Write a protein that binds this ligand. Structure first.
Ligand code: ACO
Lengths: 185, 185
């Protein structure tokens, strides 16, 4: 079924927190070890959305949140302001249903519309399903940082992939409008 | 001539701040746009050194600070705790004298002794001179993230390089001794 997506709101916090918790504990998509609290997750949500970045949820047929995705800074230094990084997390039972691709497509589309110019994915563990998802939406593998993570008793590689957004490098950004207005002080 | 290095102390912050300011304003090694104040640099120094990472200066023949370098996290998430990233800043007068090599040698050696297992360099602008410095110290180019920075009116590439440290990926780290103790909670 075509996925059901909408922007995240505060009321989605429990589901977001629990989905992320499961990934923290069981996976290598995230290199965090201790699940954040809901209050920490709330700070992160407020920070991401306060910077104008998209933060979306996927819903099941009853309207319940079953996955989420957001864009944020790669690094919040000024010169990186036209670059975003994607993060995508689905609850286990929502996997294998095309929802990851819907979420990534949504982040790509939103960030293009908003005026960003490049997107990077930092793929924990170089997880093959995650690489495949990104490749299908036009990301290219840029490097493999070997044995950079250590989790679940093993060394992990970290893959870096990139996709241009919109005009990419072909034009200069529009001065004085979002996202050129990010990280200026 | 052999470089004169020592660990940084609080009394070096004024000089460190001035060196970094020149880099912020005139270079693309750093993607920061506004020079930090000495107070801000001092907080950064406190944080880096509070995490046990090495922070060093290079001196001229009279003892004045003419460059500095430190290791710190690539990202401060648990699974990255055995990975460090190097940062090196030379005043204009310190360039072309083997001082970058000495600083990087010190970071590599220190982080090897401390028990880190990989070092990454994230090279702003992909400047060939910085790439070559790192290559000379055994780093290999891992990828080039194109048009990821925008500074001084230009799209900038960002190069990623990596060197193993010590045992690298060949052994599991010893539990409960630094740097296994970083970022745990
Ligand atoms: C930069 C990034 O954010 S990369 C994504 C990082 N996030 C995660 O890894 C979180 C956990 N995984 C997920 O959220 C998703 O599976 C994604 C985002 C990686 C991919 O989106 P999906 O819509 O599942 O796409 P797709 O069907 O192609 O995924 C196949 C993966 O889901 C697993 N899967 C499929 N159906 C199920 C199910 N019912 N229960 C549990 N797992 C399932 C598959 O086994 C496979 O994972 P594997 O390669 O480890 O075996």
């Amino acid at each position: 079924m075509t996925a059901t997506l909408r922007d995240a709101v505060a009321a989605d916090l429990r589901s977001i927190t629990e989905i992320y918790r499961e990934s923290v504990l069981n996976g290598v998509a995230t290199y965090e070890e201790t699940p954040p609290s809901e209050a920490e997750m709330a700070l992160r949500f407020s920070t991401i959305t306060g910077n104008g970045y998209p933060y979306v949820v996927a819903l099941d047929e009853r309207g319940a949140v079953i996955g989420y995705a957001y864009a944020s800074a790669f690094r919040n230094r000024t010169a990186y302001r036209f670059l975003v990084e994607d993060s995508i997390y689905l609850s286990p039972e929502a996997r294998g249903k095309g929802i990851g691709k819907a979420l990534l497509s949504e982040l790509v589309g939103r960030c293009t519309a908003l005026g960003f110019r490049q997107m990077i994915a930092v793929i924990g563990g170089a997880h093959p399903s995650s690489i495949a998802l990104h490749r299908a939406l036009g990301f290219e593998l840029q490097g493999l940082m070997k044995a950079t993570g250590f989790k679940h008793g093993r060394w992990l590689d970290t893959a870096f992939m990139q996709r241009p957004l919109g005009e990419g490098t072909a034009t200069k950004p529009t001065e004085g409008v979002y996202p050129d207005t990010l990280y200026r002080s």
